[PDB]
C-alpha cells in the first residue's frame, strides 16, 4: 500500500579525502516476493552519480528523465553538468510534481571537476535538499544506515579505507531489513578514475 516500501532497497553515500563513495543494494521485490537481484539503483550522467531508492517504476522513470535533461544540458552548455548544478535540477524537477510526487529518495554524489571538491546530497520525495558534509542515507533501511554511518564514519578517509567503511555500513544495515539485500555495489569515485565493486553478501 505504502508506495515507498513496495519494492524495497537502499542507497548510501560518503565523502573522504579527495574522493566520494556511493553504494546500493540490488534487490527488487513485490512486497514479500523477491523478483530481481540485478536491479541497480545507481546511475551516472558524465561524472555526476545519482542513486535512487523507492518505487521502482519511478526510479526507472527519473533515471530516463535526468538522462534526457543532462543530455540537452550538455548540447547547449557544451560541458558536462556539475554535482552542485545537478542537485538543483533534481530539486526543481521533483517539486514541479508537488501534489502528485514521484515516490523516491534520490542521492547525488560526485567531485566538482574544476575545484576538485567532494560533494554529496540527499532529497525527500518532493525536492528538499540535504547537503551533508559526512554522509547521506536513503531507502527502507535508512534508520539502520543512520546508525551504522554515525558510528563507523570518520572524516578524511583514504579511498581504499572509505571503501571498507561504506561497504560495512551498507551490508550490516541491509541484513537488518527484510526488503533490502540480494547483492550490493559500491562506487569509489576520484577526480579522474572510478572503480565499481560488487560485494559478496548473504542471499536471504
Amino acid at each position: 500500500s505504502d508506495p515507498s516500501s513496495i519494492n524495497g532497497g537502499i542507497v548510501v553515500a560518503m565523502t573522504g579525502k579527495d574522493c566520494v563513495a556511493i553504494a546500493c543494494d540490488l534487490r527488487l521485490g513485490s512486497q514479500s516476493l523477491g523478483v530481481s537481484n540485478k536491479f541497480e539503483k545507481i546511475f551516472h550522467y558524465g561524472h555526476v552519480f545519482l542513486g535512487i531508492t523507492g518505487l521502482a517504476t519511478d526510479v526507472t522513470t527519473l533515471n530516463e528523465m535526468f538522462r534526457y535533461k543532462t543530455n540537452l544540458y550538455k548540447l547547449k552548455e557544451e560541458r558536462a553538468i556539475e554535482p552542485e548544478t545537478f542537485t538543483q535540477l533534481v530539486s526543481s524537477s521533483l517539486y514541479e510534481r508537488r501534489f502528485g510526487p514521484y515516490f523516491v529518495g534520490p542521492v547525488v554524489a560526485g567531485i566538482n571537476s574544476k575545484s576538485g571538491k567532494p560533494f554529496i546530497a540527499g532529497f525527500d520525495l518532493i525536492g528538499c535538499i540535504d547537503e551533508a558534509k559526512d554522509f547521506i542515507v536513503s531507502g527502507t533501511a535508512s534508520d539502520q544506515l543512520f546508525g551504522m554511518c554515525e558510528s563507523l564514519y570518520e572524516p578524511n578517509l583514504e579511498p581504499e579505507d572509505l571503501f571498507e567503511t561504506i561497504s560495512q555500513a551498507l551490508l550490516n544495515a541491509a541484513d537488518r531489513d527484510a526488503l533490502s539485500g540480494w547483492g550490493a555495489v559500491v562506487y569509489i569515485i576520484k577526480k579522474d578514475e572510478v572503480v565499481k565493486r560488487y560485494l559478496k553478501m548473504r542471499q536471504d
Partner: protein
C-alpha cells in the same frame, strides 16, 4: 486473468499462460489464449483486470505493427519492452489506470539472443532468465532456482515448465484449466499444441 509464466533458455523464450476465464461463479471458457504477437519475433502474454488486458494488449500490438510498416523494420525486444513500460508508467498516474501485467518474450535477430522482460502494471521492468506474475512465482520460483541453467535446450526448458505446471496444479486452489505454451526463437513464434 490468472497464471502467466516465462522462461529463457539458450536459443529461445518460452511463455506459458492459463486457458481459464472465470466470471465470478462460473468458468465461462477453458481455451482462452492470453497472448498477442507484437512482431514476427516478439510475443507478449498478459494478465490483470477484465477488459483492460485485451484492450491494452491490442493497443500495443497496433502501435508496434504501425512502427514496422512505417520503417520497414522490426524493433528489438529491448526497444519494444521500453515502449510498453513507458505506456504503463504513463498509465499509472491516469484517471483510470490500465490494470495489466505483462511478460514480453522476444528473439533479438541482431544479437542472436533470446530475451525475456517482466513488466507489472506500475511500469516496473526487469530482464530475467525466468519470470512470472501474480501468485505463480510463489510456487514456481523455487523449482526454477534449482533447475534453471542458462544453456538449457528448448526441450529441457519445456520439461522444467511441465514440472512448474504440475506443482501449480497440485498446490493452487483455483483450477486454471491448463496452459497454452508458445516458443519464440530465430524462426519466429509457434504454439506447442500438446501440453
Amino acid at each position: 486473468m490468472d497464471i502467466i509464466l516465462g522462461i529463457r533458455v539458450q536459443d529461445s523464450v518460452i511463455l506459458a499462460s492459463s486457458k481459464a476465464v472465470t466470471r465470478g461463479i462460473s468458468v465461462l471458457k477453458d481455451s482462452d489464449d492470453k497472448t498477442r504477437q507484437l512482431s514476427p519475433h516478439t510475443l507478449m502474454s498478459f494478465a490483470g483486470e477484465a477488459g483492460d488486458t485485451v484492450q491494452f494488449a491490442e493497443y500495443i500490438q497496433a502501435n508496434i505493427q504501425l512502427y514496422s510498416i512505417r520503417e520497414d523494420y522490426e524493433l528489438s525486444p529491448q526497444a519494444v519492452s521500453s515502449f510498453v513500460r513507458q505506456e504503463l508508467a504513463k498509465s499509472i498516474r491516469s484517471r483510470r489506470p490500465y490494470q495489466v501485467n505483462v511478460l514480453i518474450g522476444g528473439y533479438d535477430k541482431k544479437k542472436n539472443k533470446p530475451e525475456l522482460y517482466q513488466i507489472d502494471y506500475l511500469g516496473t521492468k526487469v530482464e530475467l532468465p525466468y519470470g512470472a506474475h501474480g501468485y505463480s512465482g510463489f510456487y514456481t520460483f523455487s523449482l526454477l532456482d534449482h533447475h534453471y541453467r542458462p544453456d538449457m535446450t528448448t526441450e529441457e526448458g519445456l520439461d522444467l515448465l511441465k514440472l512448474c505446471v504440475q506443482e501449480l496444479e497440485k498446490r493452487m486452489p483455483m483450477d486454471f484449466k491448463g496452459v497454452i505454451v508458445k516458443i519464440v526463437d530465430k524462426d519466429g513464434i509457434r504454439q506447442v499444441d500438446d501440453f
